[PDB]
Scaffold this motif. Structure first.
Motif, PDB file in Angstrom:
ATOM      1  N   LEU A 181      12.868   0.726  -1.454  1.00 42.88           N
ATOM      2  CA  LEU A 181      12.878   1.597  -2.708  1.00 42.88           C
ATOM      3  C   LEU A 181      14.296   1.455  -3.284  1.00 42.88           C
ATOM      4  CD1 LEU A 181      11.373   3.462  -4.459  1.00 42.88           C
ATOM      5  CD2 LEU A 181      11.950   5.284  -2.828  1.00 42.88           C
ATOM      6  N   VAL A 182      14.625   1.225  -4.688  1.00 39.74           N
ATOM      7  CA  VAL A 182      15.811   1.354  -5.152  1.00 39.74           C
ATOM      8  C   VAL A 182      16.000   2.322  -6.452  1.00 39.74           C
ATOM      9  CG1 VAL A 182      17.638   0.016  -6.472  1.00 39.74           C
ATOM     10  CG2 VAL A 182      16.208  -0.957  -4.705  1.00 39.74           C
ATOM     11  N   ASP A 228       0.739   3.882  -2.723  1.00 38.96           N
ATOM     12  CA  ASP A 228       0.532   5.566  -2.610  1.00 38.96           C
ATOM     13  C   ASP A 228       1.656   6.188  -2.969  1.00 38.96           C
ATOM     14  OD1 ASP A 228      -2.140   5.186  -1.358  1.00 38.96           O
ATOM     15  OD2 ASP A 228      -1.472   5.015   0.576  1.00 38.96           O
ATOM     16  N   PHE A 229       2.754   5.827  -2.787  1.00 35.45           N
ATOM     17  CA  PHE A 229       3.971   6.518  -3.210  1.00 35.45           C
ATOM     18  C   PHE A 229       3.856   6.481  -4.829  1.00 35.45           C
ATOM     19  CE2 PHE A 229       8.149   5.605  -5.400  1.00 35.45           C
ATOM     20  CZ  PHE A 229       8.705   6.976  -5.071  1.00 35.45           C
ATOM     21  N   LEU A 230       3.753   5.457  -5.667  1.00 34.33           N
ATOM     22  CA  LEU A 230       3.425   5.817  -7.014  1.00 34.33           C
ATOM     23  C   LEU A 230       2.463   6.548  -7.578  1.00 34.33           C
ATOM     24  CD1 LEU A 230       4.448   1.853  -7.677  1.00 34.33           C
ATOM     25  CD2 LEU A 230       5.997   3.958  -8.114  1.00 34.33           C
ATOM     26  N   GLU A 288      16.212   1.127 -11.146  1.00 37.72           N
ATOM     27  CA  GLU A 288      14.993   1.375 -10.240  1.00 37.72           C
ATOM     28  C   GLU A 288      14.302   0.033  -9.984  1.00 37.72           C
ATOM     29  OE1 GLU A 288      13.373   4.521 -12.640  1.00 37.72           O
ATOM     30  OE2 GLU A 288      14.220   6.259 -11.268  1.00 37.72           O
ATOM     31  N   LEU A 289      13.596  -0.035  -8.875  1.00 45.00           N
ATOM     32  CA  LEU A 289      12.657  -1.207  -8.539  1.00 45.00           C
ATOM     33  C   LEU A 289      12.312  -0.985  -7.045  1.00 45.00           C
ATOM     34  CD1 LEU A 289      13.938  -3.471  -6.247  1.00 45.00           C
ATOM     35  CD2 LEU A 289      15.290  -4.270  -8.698  1.00 45.00           C
ATOM     36  N   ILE A 290      11.036  -1.468  -6.859  1.00 43.91           N
ATOM     37  CA  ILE A 290      10.471  -1.501  -5.293  1.00 43.91           C
ATOM     38  C   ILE A 290      10.233  -3.140  -4.972  1.00 43.91           C
ATOM     39  CG2 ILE A 290       8.477  -1.056  -4.083  1.00 43.91           C
ATOM     40  CD1 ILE A 290       7.790   1.439  -5.880  1.00 43.91           C
ATOM     41  N   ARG A 302       0.845  -1.302  -0.067  1.00 40.01           N
ATOM     42  CA  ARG A 302       0.147  -0.075   0.038  1.00 40.01           C
ATOM     43  C   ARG A 302       0.784   1.133  -0.061  1.00 40.01           C
ATOM     44  NH1 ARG A 302      -5.264   1.811   1.227  1.00 40.01           N
ATOM     45  NH2 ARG A 302      -5.199   3.743   0.548  1.00 40.01           N
ATOM     46  N   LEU A 348       8.520  -0.939 -14.582  1.00 43.52           N
ATOM     47  CA  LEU A 348       9.008  -0.887 -13.353  1.00 43.52           C
ATOM     48  C   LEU A 348       8.839  -1.871 -12.637  1.00 43.52           C
ATOM     49  CD1 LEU A 348      10.367   0.876 -11.108  1.00 43.52           C
ATOM     50  CD2 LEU A 348       7.889   1.780 -10.230  1.00 43.52           C
ATOM     51  N   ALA A 371      13.746  10.569  -3.616  1.00 44.92           N
ATOM     52  CA  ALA A 371      12.477   9.912  -3.793  1.00 44.92           C
ATOM     53  C   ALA A 371      11.823   9.200  -2.491  1.00 44.92           C
ATOM     54  CB  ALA A 371      12.625   8.701  -4.856  1.00 44.92           C
TER      55      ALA A 371
END
Lengths: 396, 396
Positions: free
Chosen positions: A260-261, A112-114, A237-239, A108, A207, A271
């Motif tokens: 977060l990367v 929300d971040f994205l 980048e990835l999560i 979640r 992503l 970020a």
């Protein structure tokens, strides 16, 4: 204000649990559970966890708020489990981790971040996936699309269909992968398939979002992270939304992480500040007890060794039940090939039973699975195996 | 994906905390804290909480997931604290409570519930209020408007201005009230003012949302709930976001509740099912340890008596510092009337200092408050009182 509200759709899973409780038949068996049970049919608190809780009871002198991103030691231990000791991502300070209330909380927070900080509009998830993935992403205003995954004939990963499905994904869409122990199928990419997927996702601008709730349950801690690490080697980048609910048996304490990367330290820190803003506006800061237990165990040689062995014991018991299930089905005259069960990873497998076979198993035999035919092999024991398999044979 | 992201605004509060840490001056005093400290300047774990944690360590045999709405005993204990034993709301089964990760988590669950299931577009909050209220409501896509509240001349509730401000609120808007110990002012409505507000809000069609994080810190458990209970007597519907962070000293364990009230049992159950859907899509189910400690204490006569006394001791120490602050300011030659400090409730008060006086106190004297001039009287002790007041006198 509330008089017109429509009731939420009744949850098929919890409705099953209620039916199971009420059911007064003695020989009843619940394979619909979503948690580990041991050979006595219990979901015990791990010994390593009890030892850690005794230490916290003796040593904690305040319950003052954690930082928004939680306990620093917990975040470091988490990144080492995800990426490996010595990983360049860690050395280059390219990753930031927020301790969250479960893996669900991490998903979640990621959503929300994205939604609030990027152009992301859409997340791709496997058909089948965990049904709560859709609710979480939709709650943040993201659409969910499905990509093909399961070959129902050989009970394996339909790799060509997966690739062809994802062709429809556009650059800047999120694609969700289960790190290991795919839920509900137990079918995971091989390392070579993970590598092919890592390259394709870079080329297409996807992503990656990894959901990693079962680290340690397929083959072991390091092996189960090879797919993620193949992606991390290839992407800027990835999560990762990870969970300690199952591998520490800490379900109700809500212990997970959102990692977060980004390409570099400056970018990930900038970020991450918005990821922290997303958390502050949700539950403010995360629950200490479960995460403190994890950090206490992971950071102490003696406790970590006990816990690692407990996790190995669960993984091994699961494998033993997969084997005993196939053997016993053969012995009770099933006739069909169920050998795919031995190869599948983690607690769950599609049995191949239809929704009507599942309903019959429940009504006539008091054996409970979920309508998709997913069964939790950790619900099987040497004692309940024969009756369970007799019933399954009866409905084939 | 992340390269263009703008950093979140740096949080003024946490920036202050960092400065305080670094500050190497010996006589430094932090009144900017948002939690209770005792006479030694510590935020201890309560004795009742340690006793409850020892009992849980000895008796818990699983960490299996709680229900979406958490521990049933916790919800019952919560409704009794909010509404009183024998309340008709309880007898008529008009209230449903979800255990949540803190009061902040309860506010977010309320906001998501209202955004997704009602026509609510706007929440009214006091000027001043807690800054995180805006972030939470905005994150759910609700606008926040402010109503007047503080008479800066007599340092009291500007009741006429409050009423006239709220005239602008439309039927179906939410109005947020602090149940007691208004944060940051310590100024609460009298019971008669609460009753007038209850009637006005019914007439105007406002949905009341109570934020109740300090029950027990103004006058006592029952007294501090009289305002809420005046509203509950008059409204068919309301929501309460309550917290046990401060009155149990359980800040980091994230222990709060969202209580939904509707006209009748059928309506509240139907609406609550959507509140549960909102939780499922967020963090799935709440953290057990802190809430289990609360239920264990509230449901055991011996533990509840120890805890009630600990809460009384905090409330009394806070009152003693309010009195000692005013006396010492007088003795150190302040000259101004600070008697409003004795009447204000809870940990916080507007000192009446300007943002520049606050900056000067920090730079020249190593005394930290927040820019609004809010001070936490629980940061004061008999030992630090004289120096603190000398400094304040120096900047007046």
């Amino acid at each position: 204000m509330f008089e017109n509200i429509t009731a939420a759709p009744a949850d098929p899973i919890l409705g099953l649990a209620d039916l199971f409780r009420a059911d007064e038949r003695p020989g009843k068996i619940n394979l619909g559970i979503g948690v580990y049970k041991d050979e006595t049919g219990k979901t015990p608190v791990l010994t390593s966890v009890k030892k850690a809780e005794q230490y916290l009871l003796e040593n904690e002198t305040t319950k003052n708020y954690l930082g928004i991103d939680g306990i620093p030691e917990f975040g470091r231990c988490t990144q080492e489990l995800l990426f490996g000791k010595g990983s360049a991502l860690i050395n280059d300070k390219r990753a930031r981790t927020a301790q969250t209330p479960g893996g669900t909380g991490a998903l979640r927070v990621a959503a929300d971040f994205l939604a609030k900080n990027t152009s992301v509009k859409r997340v791709w998830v496997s058909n089948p996936s965990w049904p709560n993935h859709k609710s979480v992403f939709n709650s943040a205003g993201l659409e969910v699309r499905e990509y093909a995954y399961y070959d129902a004939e050989n009970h394996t990963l339909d790799f060509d269909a997966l690739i062809n499905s994802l062709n429809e994904a556009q650059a800047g869409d999120v694609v969700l992968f289960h790190g290991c122990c795919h839920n509900p199928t137990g079918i995971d990419p091989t390392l070579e398939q993970w590598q092919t997927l890592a390259q394709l996702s870079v080329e297409k601008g996807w992503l990656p979002l990894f959901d990693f709730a079962y680290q340690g349950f397929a083959r072991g801690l390091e092996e189960d992270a090879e797919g993620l690490r193949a992606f991390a080697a290839m992407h800027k980048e990835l999560i990762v939304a990870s969970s300690y609910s199952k591998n520490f048996g800490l379900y109700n304490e809500r212990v997970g992480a959102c990692t977060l990367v980004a390409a570099d330290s400056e970018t990930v820190d900038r970020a991450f500040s918005q990821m922290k803003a997303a958390i502050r506006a949700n539950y403010s800061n995360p629950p200490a007890h479960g995460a403190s237990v994890v950090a206490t165990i992971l950071s102490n040689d003696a406790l970590r060794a006990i816990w690692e062995q407990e996790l190995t014991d669960m993984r091994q018991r699961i494998q033993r039940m997969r084997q005993l299930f196939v053997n016993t089905l053969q012995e009770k005259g099933a006739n069909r090939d169920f050998s795919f069960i031995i190869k599948q990873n983690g607690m769950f497998s599609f049995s191949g039973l239809t929704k009507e076979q599942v309903l019959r198993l429940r009504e006539e035999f008091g054996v409970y699975a979920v309508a998709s035919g997913r069964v939790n092999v950790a619900g099987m024991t040497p004692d309940n195996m024969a009756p369970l398999c007799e019933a399954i044979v009866a409905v084939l």
